[PDB]
Design a protein around this ligand. Structure first.
Ligand SMILES: Nc1ncnc2c1ncn2[C@@H]1O[C@H](COP(=O)(O)CP(=O)(O)OP(=O)(O)O)[C@@H](O)[C@H]1O
Ligand SMILES: Nc1ncnc2c1ncn2[C@@H]1O[C@H](COP(=O)(O)CP(=O)(O)OP(=O)(O)O)[C@@H](O)[C@H]1O
Ligand SMILES: Nc1ncnc2c1ncn2[C@@H]1O[C@H](COP(=O)(O)CP(=O)(O)OP(=O)(O)O)[C@@H](O)[C@H]1O
Ligand SMILES: Nc1ncnc2c1ncn2[C@@H]1O[C@H](COP(=O)(O)CP(=O)(O)OP(=O)(O)O)[C@@H](O)[C@H]1O
Ligand SMILES: Nc1ncnc2c1ncn2[C@@H]1O[C@H](COP(=O)(O)CP(=O)(O)OP(=O)(O)O)[C@@H](O)[C@H]1O
Ligand SMILES: Nc1ncnc2c1ncn2[C@@H]1O[C@H](COP(=O)(O)CP(=O)(O)OP(=O)(O)O)[C@@H](O)[C@H]1O
Lengths: 304, 304, 304, 304, 304, 304
């Protein structure tokens, strides 16, 4: 919905967003939204995500797909009215994204999802990319395990010529939806076949906000393989604007750079990670500051 | 509608447009249009805006979406006839934009929306853009607060991978319509995912006139990230022709240039703004001339 | 329809086309077609113009839109048959343009619409463009007033982020049709949003011929802003081939050059105008030869 | 249909094609097909041409449009079967082009349409083009009158911002069809708006064969105005492959070069024309050899 | 269908493919397939070819178009099932290409179609192309006569602005289907208007296999006129991969190079042809080795 | 489905994926999945593959196409639900790929399909490409025979102008499905006509995963002929990301290099092959290390 502000209420919001990343307990936002979700009347639509065609499928709090749901309206304090309807397994009325308010007045945040090795990581979408010899898949799994901490991370596999890999987009968004509804740390191995159908474009622009609102983190590998400048710019835009955080490889093998967005219009943070391989290619992240647009852009041209 | 002129009535029109920006009390046009809107019969369609498909959703004077409205025709002074009809929540007959006359013979104006720091600001659409390190988001919010003055400003959030951000275009236009019907100062944070569906193209060409007719101001951040010459020219065209005013960053951090259109075919005004950050990135605009097309173009190439 | 000719009937035609521009009384063609129109049976469709989709809306002699009209055919001398039918407000049978013959055997002319400052001006479509500091809007209004002479000119406003400006294409062509049905001097302030839907392409291809047939003149500002070669070439094409006359700015502020097509197969004329500003930006045109395609192409490259 | 040949029957065909251009009486083929057309049962479809959409309208021998025609089949000696059906003014079964055999075994000819100034001219389509100052419209009309000889030529006007000019493609193909059915010499002023809908593409590839089969000549002006390499190649392809003859301007004003195709796979002929203007821009062609592909290509790059 | 192999059956297949070109009696495969076709039940669909839309028309063994055919299924040795159905003149079920097995286990061959001047020529599609002064049309006809030998060759004429030339794609495929069903040597004069609808793309990828399976040869002229790199690469791909053989012009007038594919994955053969003109441009081919991919590519760039 | 992991379950998975390629008995995965398939209830849909339009056809365990199958759902451990329904021969509900779980928790593997000449080869999709004089076709057949070992390999022929070659995409995917359902070693001779319809894009994205899941290998020749950068990049992408293994030619005729993906997140292996020709072009592979992305990219540019 829309929000109204004066100098004072804006200063307050800025303070709360700052706290959502820097001082709240890591993973607390996820626990809070998990509660809001379990307070939902059973069978009520809580999330809608676009399929290949541009249509959306809808799920309930138990990650069950709702095939039918008679029209229902809800007027928010905003004055606006939200209407949801599901016919034959597809949304007839409503919108993509969360169909229940998980944030209230706490919007534009980057809820800390976890702390590891002395650094706080943001919820939302993290794109792992870069050129060079550092492997993306091993890094995505090591980050998944690290941010998970005491919790197991969820792995969504898509579009790789390996055994058991799903290659159907519609199954992919269904896997993604279920993961976000049930797990704080999510790994997506291969955004590649996504980088185009209306569904893929929707996913690219919707997932980061979906995750940030839930307080969960989605870690997706994006190999900028092609040298075709039209998708190169797409990968770069995804890395710059549809991602809450960016993890990109450097000149030095095994070393990565993390760029974190801490809130709407706030400064981006940056830090470096060292990594190494153990048996069967299992990678470990070793544990042993603000950046301006100038810096941001320099990192981005690495994609060229 | 169309208007007829001879030298004398054209001169009177030019004098009136001049006063609409330079001498009318700031924000008085907004108060005037609020009265016109309130004098509308309850349930009568006053505003139509396009959704993603290119279809239009319609609202009444109370920012409530009209789903059913029997065909009704009105013949204007012009002799032309306006016909409106709404079926199943969508405009069957009519046009995008204001469905009631908010202007009469006072057309082609840039109704002054507010005065701040000794400068008059126009209603209509303001695009905040530019390259460099000066942040756009902090600026749109500071400008929203400053032009709001005694009034709170409305914030429409769209397409950012942050908590509570809507990413569905159809919800976005619903938020925009309601904001313009109820508030004089609006902030749109992120025109990014707009820069393409028919709905997005409609918004870009419709919003400035909608707002200028209402006497409200829509301050939209537009980060010219991509270097893909096709959207680059789209961003530049938007900044040059679809905006009533332009606020662009300079070589010096914290400093901005404001290019204001004062009326149809009138000269543009320019002035500079100095700004600084305080706690939690809250930005403040400090407060302590005509330009030609050549100057205009020079600023525009900053976009490259 | 088609016309048959031999050396003699061809010479007569060229003599008559020459007269239509060079010796006929200014604005006499418009008075004549006004006569043809008014002598039409009430309700008879007289003009069809394309809407956005490519469909056409139809008007009667009083600029009223015909929503229903039973199929009716007419056989001309040509032997050809014209069939017109209107269903649910849209043309089911017929063609875009004038539905009644306003020309007969007198075709291929640029009927003189007015004489001002010692120069004869042609009816049809005039595109006012060019790069530089010379203002397009002040110029079209000044031309409208001057060619209007004793008569007021009609102003059609479209696609500008200013008050009261319509931005819906379908309302635009309805405005245009009515203006041509009722006035000899018409100004369109902004073909910009036209420069693409089938309706827009249709308008660019139809308007010039429509106006010339009626003996009215349509003066349209076309700011060649974008540097995107695809539309830049569209602006040139429109300026070169869809315009009966071209008024383009020069290196000297306030100075313009006029290129006039005087008839089918005839030479273009050229003359220069000096102008100056008075109060509130009201512009005045001061009063106080054939060209070859070489000259014409040179002017055209000013668009680059 | 298909044709079978052995060395002897092929040599015979080659001899007949040679005679169709070089020795038959000018215009005799037209008279022959005129007879074949008048021997057609009244109301039977003889010609089908594509409209904008890609559908085709059909005419009878009197250039009357057939709106209904119950399915009918005809087996040619080829063994093949030709079926024609017209429903609601549109061909339901059949093909574009002549629906009655006008040629028999005499195919691949370039029937001499006329002789003038010591040169034989071919039927089919002639495209008049080129850069420079020589005017296309005056030349098309002078050629029309010259080839007409004792007969008047038919003029089809399309897409020019002049009085009485039709701008609707569907009316244009109807004018073209009628002209080919009733006249040996046809002039089309402006193929411009054709150079894209399926109808325009069809016309470009169909007209030359339509005319060549009838023994009529279609003279169309094609101004290679745009510098957009995609249509430049289109104009060049039209001039090279969809035209039976090409008339192109040279470095010297008033001088033209004619390139004539004399038959399928035969050598092209070339000659030069001198011209001059009389009163009201009436142009006269003064009256007082084989070329290879090398030569052909050189002429074609003139279009660049 | 699919075929299984071990070293031994693969060796036998390679030996059989070798003999299909090098040792079988010229044109014997065509005689063989004629017998297979004649043994088909009357009315049974034997061949389907695509029309412009991408739909397919179907024929019986007597080159008669089938408009109605009740669904019928046949299970091949492969285990697969072929189902055919024809409704309202169009294939409802089935596939493009031969609907009956003309090959059995003899697949991947280039059945020798004829021997002339001491050289064996393959069935399938032959594209005649190249730049320079050597004429394509005279060559396809001379080759049609030479490979026909004791038999007349079939000529399918398409898309040339000459008398009796069909320009409708749907008639073109009907002519092609019938020719291949009834004649061993076919000449297609003009693949030009093909080089795009789904039907045209289908023809390019289907014709070579259709003909090679029948044992017939289709000699198509392809004039690489345009310099538009996109169709240039299309012409080159057609010449390289969609043709069983390629006949291309050299630097010397009248001299051609013949590149023949002898089987799947086998080596290509090359030989040179000298030619000369006689009366009325009738060309005669005078009669008085393996190449590598490098040579292959060299010839191909001649197309640039 | 999705899988949850912590450090320990992840290490086990990587150990198992390593084993699937490095130590499991060659071809044992295929025997295992053959077991899963045969234990499926007759009639149960087991595999869905896309046809040209983007729709999917479905097969049972016996490679028979299912035309009708009433909606049936199944809930996996994942909690997710799989729903399959087939109407009129097409999948109404379900997804492309395997409709029955062939992998369970064992995902992301490249199951060893065979061992030949001291090298283990992976199941999944192998693309055989490269520039130069080394023949693709002889190589795929030689690999098919070698990896076949004691078993015959299945050959799927598509898009070549030779006898018996199918050129219809829908028959192609039916051939492919049947081959994977019934054979461990499969060769596709020509993905060329695939490199675009939704079906083609689907195939390129699905086949590798399908084959790897089954434990079968699909060897496809892909001749990178065109120099059109758009498809050149499509060939690289397919070679880089849609292939489980890549076999590409070198500077030395007869010599190839093999790049094998050994598992999800694992390193690629590389080895070189020498080959030679025997009778009738039958090729023999002679029998007698990890790579980094740098190495991999260098190989890829050989495509340019
Ligand atoms: N306290 C502070 N001091 C200096 N700069 C600050 C600041 N707080 C915020 N900023 C700057 O404000 C800017 C905020 O970003 P914006 O320019 O609005 C684009 P964004 O929306 O953050 O990302 P986007 O363009 O990908 O959507 C950044 O340059 C940030 O560094
Ligand atoms: N009094 C004055 N003296 C000098 N120039 C004036 C003037 N009044 C207006 N102008 C110029 O007239 C021009 C008016 O704008 P125009 O070029 O006609 C269209 P616009 O207002 O720029 O809208 P647009 O950019 O969307 O097309 C500007 O160059 C303005 O500076
Ligand atoms: N008396 C004359 N002397 C010299 N040139 C003349 C002339 N009369 C006409 N022309 C030329 O003939 C042409 C007439 O204009 P048009 O009818 O438009 C034919 P065009 O200009 O060749 O094609 P177009 O439609 O692209 O402009 C112009 O070049 C005009 O200058
Ligand atoms: N007797 C002869 N002596 C020399 N050349 C001859 C000839 N007869 C015909 N030719 C040449 O044969 C060629 C015939 O043209 P082709 O190369 O087949 C292309 P076309 O079909 O004529 O035109 P197109 O490519 O635009 O469709 C021309 O180069 C012509 O000069
Ligand atoms: N005995 C032999 N000695 C050397 N090279 C041979 C050979 N037999 C076959 N070849 C080569 O093997 C290759 C066979 O062709 P491939 O590249 O596999 C596909 P193609 O037959 O060219 O069809 P395509 O061009 O449509 O893809 C050719 O380079 C051929 O010269
Ligand atoms: N033990 C190890 N030592 C060094 N590198 C290793 C490694 N194990 C795996 N890698 C590297 O990690 C990557 C594993 O391949 P993938 O799973 O495909 C991730 P990627 O290659 O970064 O993305 P991709 O899918 O585009 O190939 C490769 O670069 C591989 O070389």
């Amino acid at each position: 919905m829309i929000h109204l502000y004066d100098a004072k209420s804006f200063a307050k919001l800025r303070a709360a967003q700052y706290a959502a990343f820097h001082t709240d307990a890591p993973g607390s936002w996820f626990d809070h939204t998990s509660g809001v979700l379990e307070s939902v009347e059973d069978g009520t639509p809580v999330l809608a995500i676009g399929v290949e065609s541009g249509d959306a499928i809808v799920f309930d709090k138990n990650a069950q797909r709702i095939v039918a749901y008679k029209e229902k309206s809800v007027k928010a304090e905003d004055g606006s009215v939200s209407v949801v309807q599901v016919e034959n397994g597809f949304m007839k009325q409503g919108h993509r994204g969360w169909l229940v308010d998980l944030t209230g007045e706490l919007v534009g945040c980057s809820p800390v999802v976890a702390e590891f090795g002395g650094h706080r990581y943001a919820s939302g979408m993290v794109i792992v990319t870069g050129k060079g010899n550092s492997g993306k898949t091993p890094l995505v799994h090591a980050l998944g395990e690290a941010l998970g901490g005491k919790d197991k991370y969820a792995t969504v596999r898509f579009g790789e010529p390996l055994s058991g890999y799903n290659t159907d987009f519609n199954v992919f968004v269904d896997d993604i939806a279920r993961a976000m509804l049930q797990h704080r740390v999510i790994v997506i191995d291969s955004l590649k076949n996504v980088i185009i159908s209306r569904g893929a474009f929707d996913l690219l622009s919707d997932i980061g906000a979906m995750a940030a609102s839930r307080g969960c983190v989605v870690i997706a590998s994006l190999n900028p393989t092609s040298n075709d400048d039209k998708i190169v710019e797409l990968v770069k835009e995804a890395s710059r604007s549809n991602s809450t955080s960016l993890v990109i490889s450097t000149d030095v093998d095994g070393e990565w750079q993390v760029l974190t967005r801490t809130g709407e219009g706030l400064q981006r943070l940056t830090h470096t990670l060292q990594t190494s391989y153990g048996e069967h290619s299992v990678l470990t992240i070793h544990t042993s500051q603000a950046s301006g647009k100038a810096i941001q852009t320099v990192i981005k041209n690495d994609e060229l």
